[PDB]
Design goal:
It is classed as hydrolase. The protein has one domain: Rossmann fold. By secondary structure, it is of the alpha/beta class. A 6-stranded parallel β-sheet has the order 5-2-1-6-7-8, sandwiched between helices. Strands 3-4 form a two-stranded antiparallel ribbon. β7, α6 and β8 form a beta-alpha-beta unit. It contains 6 helices and 8 strands, in the order βααβββαβαβαβαβ. Bound molecules: zinc ion. Zinc ion binds next to loops.
Length: 216
């Protein structure tokens, strides 16, 4: 069956007042809301995701001495005895659990609450970044997503939301890797970077993993 995953439509990413506003982010709210309600699409399930950080999260520059927001940082595997590392970005503080910032934008919060839509929180563990809604950047800790998708007989997955080049792409990749037939409806996403070339880079990576990208 088809499932629709709506990635991080949250205040801190969508509101101008948010701490990590995606450019033209507000343009997504109504179209995504329509998408969520559209009979023709035959969504068997819809899942929405939230970045859900503790305030002391490792991914915020505020939590590293002598490092400012948007700097490059080297994460170290939290697995004891694992010494591999990954390059990261330290961000402004965003999506702290139970703060305006981390709420789904109202138009979507209202849809979730009135239609009882599954929420998946990612980014919860203090000690690691997660871009994908499926699992952390190490693929150590998994979320709920896959078991939920399976319970509801998902064979294909449609992904929308923000940010295109971080959580949208990472979520799409996980899904393809787990064997779902995966789609990104590009018209319903936006990048954090408002460099036009970014949409091509992601577009090409997506296709390399047999994720298929369409506009609408
Ligand atoms: Zn985050």
């Amino acid at each position: 069956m088809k499932t629709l995953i709506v990635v991080d439509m949250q205040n801190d990413f969508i509101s101008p007042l948010g701490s990590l506003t995606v450019p033209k982010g507000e343009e997504l709210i109504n179209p995504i809301s329509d998408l969520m309600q559209d009979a023709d699409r035959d969504w068997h399930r819809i899942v929405v995701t939230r970045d859900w950080h503790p305030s002391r999260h490792i991914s915020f520059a505020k939590n590293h001495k002598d490092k400012e927001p948007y700097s490059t940082y080297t994460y170290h595997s939290p697995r004891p005895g694992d010494d591999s590392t990954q390059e990261g970005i330290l961000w402004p503080v965003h999506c702290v659990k139970n703060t305006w910032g981390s709420q789904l934008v109202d138009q979507i919060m209202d849809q979730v609450v009135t239609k009882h839509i599954k929420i998946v929180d990612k980014g919860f563990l203090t000690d690691r970044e997660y871009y994908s809604a499926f699992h952390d950047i190490w693929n150590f800790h998994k979320t709920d997503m896959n078991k939920y998708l399976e319970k509801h007989h998902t064979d294909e997955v449609y992904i929308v939301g923000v940010a295109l080049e971080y959580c949208v792409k990472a979520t799409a990749i996980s899904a393809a890797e787990l064997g779902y037939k995966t789609t990104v409806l590009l018209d319903y996403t936006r990048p954090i970077s408002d460099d036009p070339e970014v949409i091509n880079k992601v577009k090409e990576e997506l296709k390399a993993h047999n994720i298929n990208v369409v506009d609408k």
